[PDB]
CSV table of N, CA and C in Angstrom, one decimal:
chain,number,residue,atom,x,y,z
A,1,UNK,N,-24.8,-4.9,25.7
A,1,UNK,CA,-25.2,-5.8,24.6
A,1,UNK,C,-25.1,-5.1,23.2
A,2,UNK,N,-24.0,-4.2,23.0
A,2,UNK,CA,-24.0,-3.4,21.9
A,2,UNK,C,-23.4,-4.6,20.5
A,3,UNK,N,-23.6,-4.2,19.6
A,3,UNK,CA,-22.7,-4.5,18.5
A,3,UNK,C,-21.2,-4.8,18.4
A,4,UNK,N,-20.9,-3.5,19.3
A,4,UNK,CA,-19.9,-3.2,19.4
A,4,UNK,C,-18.7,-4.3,20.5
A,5,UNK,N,-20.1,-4.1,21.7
A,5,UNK,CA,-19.3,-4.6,22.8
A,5,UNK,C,-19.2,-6.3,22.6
A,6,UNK,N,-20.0,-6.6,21.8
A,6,UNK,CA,-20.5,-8.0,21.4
A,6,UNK,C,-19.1,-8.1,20.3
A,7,UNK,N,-18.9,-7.5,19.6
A,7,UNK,CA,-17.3,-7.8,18.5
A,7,UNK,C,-16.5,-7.8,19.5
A,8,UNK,N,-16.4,-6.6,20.4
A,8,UNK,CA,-15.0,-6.8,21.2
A,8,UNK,C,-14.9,-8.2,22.3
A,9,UNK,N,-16.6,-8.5,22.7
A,9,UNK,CA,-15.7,-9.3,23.2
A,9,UNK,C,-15.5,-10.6,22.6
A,10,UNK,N,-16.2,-11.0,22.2
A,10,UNK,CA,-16.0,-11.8,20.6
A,10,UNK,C,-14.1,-12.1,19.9
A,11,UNK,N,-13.7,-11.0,19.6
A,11,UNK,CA,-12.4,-10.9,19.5
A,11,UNK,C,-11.4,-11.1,21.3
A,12,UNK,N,-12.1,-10.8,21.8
A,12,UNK,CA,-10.7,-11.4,23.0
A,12,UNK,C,-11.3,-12.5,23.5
A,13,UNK,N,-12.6,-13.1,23.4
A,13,UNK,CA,-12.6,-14.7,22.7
A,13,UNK,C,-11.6,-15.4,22.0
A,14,UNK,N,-11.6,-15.1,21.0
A,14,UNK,CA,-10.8,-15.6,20.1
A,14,UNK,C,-9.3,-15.7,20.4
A,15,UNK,N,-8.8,-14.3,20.4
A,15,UNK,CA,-7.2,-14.4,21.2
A,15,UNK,C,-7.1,-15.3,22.8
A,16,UNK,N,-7.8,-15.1,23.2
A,16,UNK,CA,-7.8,-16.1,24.3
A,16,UNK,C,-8.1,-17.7,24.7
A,17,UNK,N,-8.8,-17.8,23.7
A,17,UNK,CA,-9.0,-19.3,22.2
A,17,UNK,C,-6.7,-19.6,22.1
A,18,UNK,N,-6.8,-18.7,21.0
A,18,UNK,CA,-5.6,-19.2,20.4
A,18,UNK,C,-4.6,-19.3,21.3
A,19,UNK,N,-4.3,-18.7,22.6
A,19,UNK,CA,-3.3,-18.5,23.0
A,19,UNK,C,-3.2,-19.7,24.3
A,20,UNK,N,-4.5,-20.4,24.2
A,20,UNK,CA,-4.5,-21.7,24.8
A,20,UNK,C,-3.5,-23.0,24.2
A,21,UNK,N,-3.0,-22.3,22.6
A,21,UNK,CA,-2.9,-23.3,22.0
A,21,UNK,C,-1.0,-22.9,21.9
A,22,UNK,N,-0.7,-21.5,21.5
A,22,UNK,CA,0.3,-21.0,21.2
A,22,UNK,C,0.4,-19.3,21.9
A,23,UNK,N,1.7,-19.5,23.0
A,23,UNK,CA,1.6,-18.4,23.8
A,23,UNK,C,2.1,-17.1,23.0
A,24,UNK,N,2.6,-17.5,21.4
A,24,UNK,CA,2.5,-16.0,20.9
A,24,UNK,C,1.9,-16.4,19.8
A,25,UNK,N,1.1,-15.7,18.9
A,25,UNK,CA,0.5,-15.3,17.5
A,25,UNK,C,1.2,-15.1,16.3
A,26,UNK,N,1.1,-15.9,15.7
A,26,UNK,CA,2.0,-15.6,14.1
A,26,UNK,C,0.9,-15.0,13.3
A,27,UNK,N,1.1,-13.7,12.8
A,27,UNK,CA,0.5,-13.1,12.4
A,27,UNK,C,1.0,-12.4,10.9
A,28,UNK,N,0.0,-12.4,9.9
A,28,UNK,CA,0.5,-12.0,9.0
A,28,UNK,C,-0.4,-10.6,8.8
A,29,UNK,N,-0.2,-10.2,7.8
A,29,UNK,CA,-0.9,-8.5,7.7
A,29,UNK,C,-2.2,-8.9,7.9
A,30,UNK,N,-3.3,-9.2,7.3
A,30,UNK,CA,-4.7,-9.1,7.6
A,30,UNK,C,-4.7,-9.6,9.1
A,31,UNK,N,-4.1,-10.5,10.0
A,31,UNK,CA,-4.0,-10.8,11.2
A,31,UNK,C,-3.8,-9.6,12.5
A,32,UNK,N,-2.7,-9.3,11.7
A,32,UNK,CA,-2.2,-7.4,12.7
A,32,UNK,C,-3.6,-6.7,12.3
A,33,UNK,N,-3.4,-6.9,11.2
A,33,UNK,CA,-5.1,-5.2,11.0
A,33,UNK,C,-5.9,-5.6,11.9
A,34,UNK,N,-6.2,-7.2,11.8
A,34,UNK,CA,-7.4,-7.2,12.8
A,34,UNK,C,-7.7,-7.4,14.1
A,35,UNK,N,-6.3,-7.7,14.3
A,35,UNK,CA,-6.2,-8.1,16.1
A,35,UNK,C,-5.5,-6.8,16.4
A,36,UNK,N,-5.3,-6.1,16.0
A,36,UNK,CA,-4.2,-4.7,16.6
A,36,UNK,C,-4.8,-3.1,16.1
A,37,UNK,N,-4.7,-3.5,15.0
A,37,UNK,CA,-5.0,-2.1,14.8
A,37,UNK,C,-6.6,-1.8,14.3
A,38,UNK,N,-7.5,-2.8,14.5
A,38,UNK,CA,-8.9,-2.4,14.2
A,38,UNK,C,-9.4,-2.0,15.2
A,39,UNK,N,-10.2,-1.4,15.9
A,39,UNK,CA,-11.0,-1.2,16.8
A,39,UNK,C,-12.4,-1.8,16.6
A,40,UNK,N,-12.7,-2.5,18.0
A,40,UNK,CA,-12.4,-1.9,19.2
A,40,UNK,C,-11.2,-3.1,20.0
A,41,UNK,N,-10.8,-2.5,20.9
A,41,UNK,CA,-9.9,-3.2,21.4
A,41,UNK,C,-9.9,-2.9,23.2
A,42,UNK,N,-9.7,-3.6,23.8
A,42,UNK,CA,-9.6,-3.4,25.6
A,42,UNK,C,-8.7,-4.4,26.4
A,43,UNK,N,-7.3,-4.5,25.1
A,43,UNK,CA,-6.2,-5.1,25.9
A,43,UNK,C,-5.0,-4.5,25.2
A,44,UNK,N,-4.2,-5.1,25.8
A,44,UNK,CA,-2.4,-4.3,25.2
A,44,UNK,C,-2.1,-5.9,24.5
A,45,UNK,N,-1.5,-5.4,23.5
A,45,UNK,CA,-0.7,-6.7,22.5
A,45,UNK,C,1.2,-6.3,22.5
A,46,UNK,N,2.0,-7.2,22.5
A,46,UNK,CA,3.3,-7.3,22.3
A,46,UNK,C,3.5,-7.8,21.3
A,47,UNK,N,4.3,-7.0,20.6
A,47,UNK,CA,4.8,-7.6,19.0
A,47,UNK,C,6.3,-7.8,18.8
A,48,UNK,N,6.6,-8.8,18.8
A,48,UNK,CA,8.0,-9.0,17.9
A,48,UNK,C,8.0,-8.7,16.4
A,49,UNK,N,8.3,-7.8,15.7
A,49,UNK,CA,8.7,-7.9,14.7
A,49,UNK,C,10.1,-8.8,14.2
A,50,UNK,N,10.3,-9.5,13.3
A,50,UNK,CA,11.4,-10.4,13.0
A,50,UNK,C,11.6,-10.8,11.8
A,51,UNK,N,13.1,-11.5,11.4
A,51,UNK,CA,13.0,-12.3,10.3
A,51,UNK,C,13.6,-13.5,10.5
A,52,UNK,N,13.2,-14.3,10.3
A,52,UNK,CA,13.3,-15.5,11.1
A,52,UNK,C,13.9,-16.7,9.8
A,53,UNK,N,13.1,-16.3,8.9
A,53,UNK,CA,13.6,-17.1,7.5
A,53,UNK,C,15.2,-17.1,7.5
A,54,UNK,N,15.4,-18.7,7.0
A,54,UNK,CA,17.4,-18.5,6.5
A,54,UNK,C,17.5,-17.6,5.8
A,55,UNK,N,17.0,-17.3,4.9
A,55,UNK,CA,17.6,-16.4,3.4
A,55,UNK,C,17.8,-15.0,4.3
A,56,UNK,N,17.1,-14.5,5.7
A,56,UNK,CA,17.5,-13.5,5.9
A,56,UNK,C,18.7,-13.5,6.6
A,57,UNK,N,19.0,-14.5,7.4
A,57,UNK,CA,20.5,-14.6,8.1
A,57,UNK,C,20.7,-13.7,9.4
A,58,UNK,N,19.7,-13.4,10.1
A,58,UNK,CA,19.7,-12.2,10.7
A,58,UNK,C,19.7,-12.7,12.3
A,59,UNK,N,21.2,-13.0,12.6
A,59,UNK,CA,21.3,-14.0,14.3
A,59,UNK,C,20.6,-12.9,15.5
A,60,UNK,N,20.5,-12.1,14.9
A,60,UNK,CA,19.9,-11.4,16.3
A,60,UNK,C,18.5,-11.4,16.4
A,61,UNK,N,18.0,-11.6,15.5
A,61,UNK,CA,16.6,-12.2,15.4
A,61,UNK,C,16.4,-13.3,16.1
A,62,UNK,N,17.3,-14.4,16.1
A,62,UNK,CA,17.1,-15.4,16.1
A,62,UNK,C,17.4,-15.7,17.5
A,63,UNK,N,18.5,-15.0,18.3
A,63,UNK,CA,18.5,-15.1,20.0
A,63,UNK,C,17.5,-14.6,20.2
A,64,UNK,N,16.9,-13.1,19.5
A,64,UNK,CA,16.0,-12.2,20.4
A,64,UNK,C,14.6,-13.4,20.9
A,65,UNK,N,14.7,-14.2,19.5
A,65,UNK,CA,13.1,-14.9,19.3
A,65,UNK,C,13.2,-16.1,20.2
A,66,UNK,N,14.3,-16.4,21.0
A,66,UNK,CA,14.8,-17.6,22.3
A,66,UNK,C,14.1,-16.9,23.7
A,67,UNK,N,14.2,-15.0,23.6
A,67,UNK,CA,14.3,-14.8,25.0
A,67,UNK,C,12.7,-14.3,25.0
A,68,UNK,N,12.1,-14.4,23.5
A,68,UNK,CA,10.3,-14.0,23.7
A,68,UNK,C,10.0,-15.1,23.8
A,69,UNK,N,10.4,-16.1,23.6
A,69,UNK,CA,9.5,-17.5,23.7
A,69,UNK,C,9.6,-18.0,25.7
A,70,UNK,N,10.5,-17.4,25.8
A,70,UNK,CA,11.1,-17.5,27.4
A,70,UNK,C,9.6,-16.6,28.3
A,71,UNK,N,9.7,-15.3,27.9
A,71,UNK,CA,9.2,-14.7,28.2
A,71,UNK,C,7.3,-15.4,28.1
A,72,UNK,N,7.0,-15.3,27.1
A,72,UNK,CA,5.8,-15.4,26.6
A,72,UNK,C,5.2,-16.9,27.1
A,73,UNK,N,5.8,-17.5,27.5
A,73,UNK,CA,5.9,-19.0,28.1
A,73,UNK,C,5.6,-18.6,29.7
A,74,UNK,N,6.4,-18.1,30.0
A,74,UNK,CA,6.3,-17.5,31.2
A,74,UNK,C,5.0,-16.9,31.8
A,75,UNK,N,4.3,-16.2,31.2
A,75,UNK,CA,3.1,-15.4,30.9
A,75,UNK,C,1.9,-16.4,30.7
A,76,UNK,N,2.5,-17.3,30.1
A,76,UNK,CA,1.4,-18.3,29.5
A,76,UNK,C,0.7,-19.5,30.9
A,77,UNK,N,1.8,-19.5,31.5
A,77,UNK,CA,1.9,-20.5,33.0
A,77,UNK,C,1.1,-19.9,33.9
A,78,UNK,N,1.3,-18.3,33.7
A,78,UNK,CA,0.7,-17.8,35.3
A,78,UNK,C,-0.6,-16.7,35.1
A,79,UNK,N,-1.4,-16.7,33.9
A,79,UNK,CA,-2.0,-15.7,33.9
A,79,UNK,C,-3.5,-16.2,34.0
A,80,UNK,N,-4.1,-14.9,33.0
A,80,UNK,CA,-6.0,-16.0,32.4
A,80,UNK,C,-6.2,-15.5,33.9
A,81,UNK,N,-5.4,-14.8,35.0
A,81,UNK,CA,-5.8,-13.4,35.5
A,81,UNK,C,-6.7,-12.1,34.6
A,82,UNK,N,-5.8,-12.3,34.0
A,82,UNK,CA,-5.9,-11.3,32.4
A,82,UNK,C,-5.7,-12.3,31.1
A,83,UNK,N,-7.1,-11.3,30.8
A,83,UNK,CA,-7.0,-11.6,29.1
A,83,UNK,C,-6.9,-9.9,28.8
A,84,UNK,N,-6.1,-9.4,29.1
A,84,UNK,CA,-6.0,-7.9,28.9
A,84,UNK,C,-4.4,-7.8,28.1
A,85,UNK,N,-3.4,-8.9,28.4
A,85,UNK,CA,-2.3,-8.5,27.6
A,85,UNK,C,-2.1,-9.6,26.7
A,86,UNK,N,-1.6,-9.9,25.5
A,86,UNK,CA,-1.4,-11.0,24.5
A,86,UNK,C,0.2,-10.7,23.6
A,87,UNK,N,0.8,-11.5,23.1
A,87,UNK,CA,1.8,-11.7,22.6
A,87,UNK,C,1.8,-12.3,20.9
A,88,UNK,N,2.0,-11.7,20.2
A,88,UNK,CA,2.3,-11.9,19.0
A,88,UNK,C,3.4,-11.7,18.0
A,89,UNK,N,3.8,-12.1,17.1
A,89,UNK,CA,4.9,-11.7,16.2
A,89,UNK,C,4.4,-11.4,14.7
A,90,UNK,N,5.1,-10.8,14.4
A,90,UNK,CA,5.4,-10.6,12.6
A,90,UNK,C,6.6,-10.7,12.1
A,91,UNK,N,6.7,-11.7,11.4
A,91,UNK,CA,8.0,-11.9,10.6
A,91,UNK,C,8.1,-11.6,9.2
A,92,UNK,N,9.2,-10.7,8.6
A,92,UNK,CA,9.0,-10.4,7.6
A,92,UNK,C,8.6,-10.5,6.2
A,93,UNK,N,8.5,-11.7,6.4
A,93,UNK,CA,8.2,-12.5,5.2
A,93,UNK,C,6.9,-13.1,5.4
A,94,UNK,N,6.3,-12.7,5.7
A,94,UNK,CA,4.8,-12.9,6.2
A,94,UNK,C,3.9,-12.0,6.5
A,95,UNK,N,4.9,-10.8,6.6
A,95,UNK,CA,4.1,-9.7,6.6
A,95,UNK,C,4.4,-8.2,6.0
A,96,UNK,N,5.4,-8.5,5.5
A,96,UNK,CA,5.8,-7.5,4.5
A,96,UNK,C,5.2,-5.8,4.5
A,97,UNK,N,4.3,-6.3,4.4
A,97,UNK,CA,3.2,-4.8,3.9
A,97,UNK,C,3.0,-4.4,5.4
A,98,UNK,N,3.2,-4.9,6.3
A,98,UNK,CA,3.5,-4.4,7.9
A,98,UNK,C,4.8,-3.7,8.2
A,99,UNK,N,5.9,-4.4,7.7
A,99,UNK,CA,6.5,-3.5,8.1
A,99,UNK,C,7.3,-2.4,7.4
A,100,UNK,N,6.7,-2.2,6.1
A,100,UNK,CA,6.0,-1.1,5.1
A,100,UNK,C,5.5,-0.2,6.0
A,101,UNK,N,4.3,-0.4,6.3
A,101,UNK,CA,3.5,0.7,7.1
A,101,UNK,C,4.3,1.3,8.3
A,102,UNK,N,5.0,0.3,9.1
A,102,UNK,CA,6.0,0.9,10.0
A,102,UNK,C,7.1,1.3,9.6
A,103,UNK,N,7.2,1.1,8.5
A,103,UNK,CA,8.6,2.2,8.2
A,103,UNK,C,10.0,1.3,8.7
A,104,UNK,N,10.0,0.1,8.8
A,104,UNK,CA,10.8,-0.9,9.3
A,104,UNK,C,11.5,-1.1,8.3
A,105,UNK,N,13.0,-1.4,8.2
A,105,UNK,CA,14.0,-1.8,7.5
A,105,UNK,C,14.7,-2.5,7.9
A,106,UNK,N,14.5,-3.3,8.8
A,106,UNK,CA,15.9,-4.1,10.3
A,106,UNK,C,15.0,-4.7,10.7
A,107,UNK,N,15.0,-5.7,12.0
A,107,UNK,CA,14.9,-6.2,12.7
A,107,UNK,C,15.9,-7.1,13.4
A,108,UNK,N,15.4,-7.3,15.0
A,108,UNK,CA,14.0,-7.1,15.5
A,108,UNK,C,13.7,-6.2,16.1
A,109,UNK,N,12.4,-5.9,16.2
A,109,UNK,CA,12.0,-4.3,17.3
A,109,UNK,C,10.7,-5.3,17.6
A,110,UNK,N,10.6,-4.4,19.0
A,110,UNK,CA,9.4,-5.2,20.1
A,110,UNK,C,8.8,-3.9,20.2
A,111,UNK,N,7.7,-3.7,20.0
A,111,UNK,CA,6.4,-3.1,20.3
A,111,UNK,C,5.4,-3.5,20.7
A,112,UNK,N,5.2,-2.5,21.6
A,112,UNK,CA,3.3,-2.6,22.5
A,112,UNK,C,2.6,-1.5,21.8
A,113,UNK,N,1.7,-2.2,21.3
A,113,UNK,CA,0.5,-1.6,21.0
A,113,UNK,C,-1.4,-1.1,22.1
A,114,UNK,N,-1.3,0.0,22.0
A,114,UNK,CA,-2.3,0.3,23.6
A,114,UNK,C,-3.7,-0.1,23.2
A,115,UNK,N,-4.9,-0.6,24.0
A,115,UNK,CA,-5.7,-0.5,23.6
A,115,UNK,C,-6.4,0.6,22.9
A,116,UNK,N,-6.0,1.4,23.2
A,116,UNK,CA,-6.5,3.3,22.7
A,116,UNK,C,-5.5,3.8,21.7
A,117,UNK,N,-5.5,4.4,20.8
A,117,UNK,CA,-4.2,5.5,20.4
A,117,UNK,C,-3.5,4.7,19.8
A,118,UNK,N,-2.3,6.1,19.3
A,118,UNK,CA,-1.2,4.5,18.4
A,118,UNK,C,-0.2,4.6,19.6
A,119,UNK,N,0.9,3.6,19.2
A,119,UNK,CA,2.0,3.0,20.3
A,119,UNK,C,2.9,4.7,20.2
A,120,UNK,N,2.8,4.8,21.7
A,120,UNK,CA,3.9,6.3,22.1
A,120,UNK,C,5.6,5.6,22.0
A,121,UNK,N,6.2,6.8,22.1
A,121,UNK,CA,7.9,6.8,22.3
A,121,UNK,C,8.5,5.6,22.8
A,122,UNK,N,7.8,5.5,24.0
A,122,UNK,CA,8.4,4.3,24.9
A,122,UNK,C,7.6,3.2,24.9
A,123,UNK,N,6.5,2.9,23.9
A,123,UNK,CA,6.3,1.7,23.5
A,123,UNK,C,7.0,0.6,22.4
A,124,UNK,N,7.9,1.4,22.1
A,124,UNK,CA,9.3,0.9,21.3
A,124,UNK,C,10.6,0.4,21.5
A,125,UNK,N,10.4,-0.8,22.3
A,125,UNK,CA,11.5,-1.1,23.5
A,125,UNK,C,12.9,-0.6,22.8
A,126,UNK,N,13.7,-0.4,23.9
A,126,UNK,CA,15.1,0.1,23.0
A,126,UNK,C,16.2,-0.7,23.3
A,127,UNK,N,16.1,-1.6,22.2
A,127,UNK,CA,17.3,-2.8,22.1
A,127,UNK,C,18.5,-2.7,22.1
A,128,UNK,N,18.4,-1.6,21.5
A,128,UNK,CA,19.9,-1.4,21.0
A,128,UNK,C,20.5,-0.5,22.6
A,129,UNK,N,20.0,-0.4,23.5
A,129,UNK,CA,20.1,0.5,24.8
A,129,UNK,C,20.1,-1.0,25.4
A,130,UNK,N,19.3,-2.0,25.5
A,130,UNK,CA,19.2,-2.3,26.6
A,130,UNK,C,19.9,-4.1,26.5
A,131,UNK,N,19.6,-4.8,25.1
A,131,UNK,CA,19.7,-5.5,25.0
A,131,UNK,C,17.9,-6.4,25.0
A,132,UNK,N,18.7,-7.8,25.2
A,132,UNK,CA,17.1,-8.8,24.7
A,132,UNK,C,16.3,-9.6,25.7
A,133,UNK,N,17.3,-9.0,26.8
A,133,UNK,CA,17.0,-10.5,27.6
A,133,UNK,C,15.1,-10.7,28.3
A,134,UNK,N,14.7,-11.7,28.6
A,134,UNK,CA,13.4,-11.6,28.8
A,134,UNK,C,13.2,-10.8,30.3
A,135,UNK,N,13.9,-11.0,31.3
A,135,UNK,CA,13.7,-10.1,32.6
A,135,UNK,C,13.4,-8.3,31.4
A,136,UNK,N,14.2,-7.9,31.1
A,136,UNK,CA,14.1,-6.9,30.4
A,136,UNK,C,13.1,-6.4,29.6
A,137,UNK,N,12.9,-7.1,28.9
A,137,UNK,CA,11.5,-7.4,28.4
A,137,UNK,C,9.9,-7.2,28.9
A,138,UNK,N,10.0,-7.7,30.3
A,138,UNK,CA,9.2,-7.8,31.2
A,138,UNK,C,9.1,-6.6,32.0
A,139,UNK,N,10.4,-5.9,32.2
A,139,UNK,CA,10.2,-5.1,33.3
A,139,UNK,C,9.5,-3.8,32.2
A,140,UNK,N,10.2,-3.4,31.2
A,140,UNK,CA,9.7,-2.7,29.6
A,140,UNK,C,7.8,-2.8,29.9
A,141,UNK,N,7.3,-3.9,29.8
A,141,UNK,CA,6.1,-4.4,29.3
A,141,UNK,C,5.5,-3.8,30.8
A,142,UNK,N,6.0,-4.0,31.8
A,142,UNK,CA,5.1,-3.8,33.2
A,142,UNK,C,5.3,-1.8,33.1
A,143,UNK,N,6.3,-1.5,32.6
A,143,UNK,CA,6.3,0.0,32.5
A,143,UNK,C,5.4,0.8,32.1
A,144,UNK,N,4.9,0.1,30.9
A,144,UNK,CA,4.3,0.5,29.4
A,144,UNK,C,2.8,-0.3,29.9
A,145,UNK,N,2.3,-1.4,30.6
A,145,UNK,CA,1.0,-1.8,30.9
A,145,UNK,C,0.3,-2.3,32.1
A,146,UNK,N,1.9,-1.8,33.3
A,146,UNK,CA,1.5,-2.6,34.7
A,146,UNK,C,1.1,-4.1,34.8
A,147,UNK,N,1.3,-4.8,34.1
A,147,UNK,CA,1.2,-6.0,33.9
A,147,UNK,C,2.5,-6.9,34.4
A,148,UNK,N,3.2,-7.5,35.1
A,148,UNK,CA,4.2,-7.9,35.9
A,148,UNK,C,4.6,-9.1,35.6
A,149,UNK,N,5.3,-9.5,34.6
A,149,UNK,CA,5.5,-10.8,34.1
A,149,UNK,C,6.6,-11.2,35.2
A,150,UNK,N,7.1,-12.8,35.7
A,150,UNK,CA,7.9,-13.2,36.3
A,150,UNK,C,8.6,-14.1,35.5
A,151,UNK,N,9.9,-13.8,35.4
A,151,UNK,CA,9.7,-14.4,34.3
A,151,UNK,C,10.8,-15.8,34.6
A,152,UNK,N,10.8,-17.7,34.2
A,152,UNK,CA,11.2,-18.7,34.8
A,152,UNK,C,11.4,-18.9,33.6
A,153,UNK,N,12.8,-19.9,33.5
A,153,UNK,CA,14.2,-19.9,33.9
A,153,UNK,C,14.9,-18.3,33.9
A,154,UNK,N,15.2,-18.0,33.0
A,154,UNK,CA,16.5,-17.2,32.3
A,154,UNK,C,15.8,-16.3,30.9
């Protein structure tokens, strides 16, 4: 009954609230600070980073963002096993000063963020190695958090 444990769980309340409604999180910078990188935290999050706006024109954004909604849909059907893993995005035009801080100039890149620590090597899926598809995705994500998405249709 700490302060502490009372915020944390308070906050996966809440992500577990929203994700009733929407199986990924649109998130802008104050949203990431507070659901990802504040402590305390006792789940893993998935991030798309993206640009999804016309003015950016960026088609690979725009399949990748077909095979996370595949994915994250998927997730959404069979879990509430766990409220330990959640799905979110940041698109650049919404969150700017995020991917500032990451050092981001492109998209999209998919990162898992741990509940502990910052995201290691191979929390940075590697797209350009593997491609987008959601099976892929999935197998990435169960590597990185043992979490075993199945993922239906394609």
């Amino acid at each position: 009954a700490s302060k502490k444990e009372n915020l944390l769980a308070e906050k996966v309340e809440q992500l577990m609230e929203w994700s009733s409604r929407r199986s990924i999180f649109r998130m802008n910078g104050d949203k990431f600070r507070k659901f990802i990188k504040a402590p305390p935290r006792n789940y893993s999050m998935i991030v798309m980073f993206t640009a999804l706006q016309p003015q950016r024109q960026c088609s690979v954004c725009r399949q990748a963002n077909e095979e996370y909604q595949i994915l994250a849909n998927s997730w959404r059907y069979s879990s509430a096993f766990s409220n330990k893993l959640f799905f979110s995005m940041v698109d650049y035009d919404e969150g700017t000063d995020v991917f500032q801080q990451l050092n981001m100039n492109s998209a999209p890149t998919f990162m898992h963020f741990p509940p502990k620590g910052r995201p290691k090597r191979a929390d940075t899926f590697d797209l350009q190695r593997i491609g987008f598809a959601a099976e892929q995705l999935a197998k990435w994500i169960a590597d990185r958090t043992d979490v075993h998405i199945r993922v239906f249709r394609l």
